[PDB]
């Protein structure tokens, strides 16, 4: 069925992770589809089921493994498989409902959470904001383990939510943003974990609005400014696709 990109946190390097994110990006795109120089993800509408998802297999030094499912339209995690069991975030509608039934068809245990995978919800359940959750190879190593143990009852809900937040940001947000990909690279480089600062968070928050601004722009000029934050929380605006070329690697389809 769907394509699989493999990644292991064990002895992971900057090159190791960079090849992984490139590979991941490569599988989302491309229809040679570029608006104002930023690649655009496939349009949800009319998309055949078999082009809908990509799988990401993750494993750690303990040889524990899980597989994440990402929607090619938003590059967001919709759920995961570990062994006999598969879990899914709550679908926003029946179209997305039906869609996810094509994932992990062999898995003998299927579960769909009552809650979605949006940050607001996951932060509540984790007992922490993205601000207070650390990222890096270590946090990811653990997240894999936490998901693996979830079906046997070895993982507390807050720990699971926390583990989702780690995966989404280190995989989805990383694929969406070369800028976020780079922040992760640094953590791996120095073999340290840290929580993301406002510059990462406001980007994540604004991915949809930037997608719109860019695709609906005039010759690259934003109809209206998008305000972001710097590391110290100071606000600034983006008026043009130009400055975002090196920043954002992908966009959800708009128009």
């Amino acid at each position, epitope marked *: 069925q769907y394509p699989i990109i493999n990644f292991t946190t064990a002895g992971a390097t900057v090159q190791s992770y960079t090849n992984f994110i490139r590979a991941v990006r490569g599988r989302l795109t491309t229809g040679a589809d570029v608006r104002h120089e930023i690649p655009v993800l496939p349009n949800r509408v009319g998309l055949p089921i078999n082009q809908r998802f990509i799988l990401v297999e993750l494993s*750690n030094h303990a*040889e524990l493994s899980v597989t994440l499912a990402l929607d090619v339209t938003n590059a967001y995690v919709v759920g995961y498989r570990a062994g006999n069991s598969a879990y899914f975030f709550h679908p926003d509608n029946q179209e997305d409902a039906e869609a996810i039934t094509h994932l992990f068809t062999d898995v003998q245990n299927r579960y769909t959470f009552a809650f979605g995978g949006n940050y607001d919800r996951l932060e509540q359940l984790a007992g922490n904001l993205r601000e207070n959750i650390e990222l890096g190879n270590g946090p990811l*190593e653990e997240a894999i383990s936490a998901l693996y143990y979830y079906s046997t009852g*070895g993982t507390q809900l807050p720990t699971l939510a926390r583990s989702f937040i780690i995966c989404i940001q280190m995989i989805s947000e990383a694929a969406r943003f070369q800028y976020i990909e780079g922040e992760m690279r640094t953590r791996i480089r120095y073999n340290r974990r840290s929580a993301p600062d406002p510059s990462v968070i406001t980007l994540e928050n604004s991915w949809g609005r930037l997608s719109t601004a860019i695709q609906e722009s005039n010759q690259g000029a934003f109809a209206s400014p998008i305000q972001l934050q710097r590391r110290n929380g100071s606000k600034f605006s983006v008026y043009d696709v130009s400055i975002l070329i090196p920043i954002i690697a992908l966009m959800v389809y708009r128009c």
Partner: nanobody
Framework: NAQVQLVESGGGLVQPGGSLRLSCVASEFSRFTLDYYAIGWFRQAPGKEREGLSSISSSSDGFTSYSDSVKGRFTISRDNAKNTVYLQMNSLKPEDTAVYYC?????????????????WGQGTQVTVS
């Protein structure tokens, strides 16, 4: 499987202000060595329930966690050649008195939750007077 036997030791009676060093020793011939494991340290008073104190992740970056109660007094550490993990309890005081436990999970993280480890030591009593 992940089967491993945890034999702890190093507990006992101590004068207030004193210090002790606990040991989680993983017995030989488990498929994986102890460095593949997260090790939690818990303590339980008779009328009370299990409580997480210090923890160390399986993660390669050596992440450790400490409850507010023991922070700066207690230090968790590894000796891999001995397949062992140490807990150094300093500046000890009577309130610390309780039975202490070591706990492990393969590829685990640093948790204060008993549900989040799969394997336990037999426990060792600590008393400060």
């Amino acid at each position: 499987n992940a089967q491993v036997q945890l034999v702890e030791s190093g507990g006992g009676l101590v004068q207030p202000g004193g210090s002790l060093r606990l040991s989680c020793v993983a017995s030989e011939f488990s498929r994986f060595t102890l460095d593949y494991y997260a090790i939690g340290w818990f303590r339980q008073a008779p009328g009370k329930e299990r409580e997480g104190l210090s923890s160390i992740s399986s993660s390669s970056d050596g992440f450790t966690s400490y409850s507010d109660s023991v922070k700066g007094r207690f230090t968790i550490s590894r000796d891999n050649a001995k397949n062992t993990v140490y807990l150094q309890m300093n500046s000890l005081k009577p309130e610390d008195t309780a039975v202490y436990y070591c706990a492990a999970r393969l590829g685990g993280w640093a948790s204060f939750s008993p549900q989040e480890y799969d394997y336990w030591g037999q426990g060792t009593q600590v008393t400060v007077s």
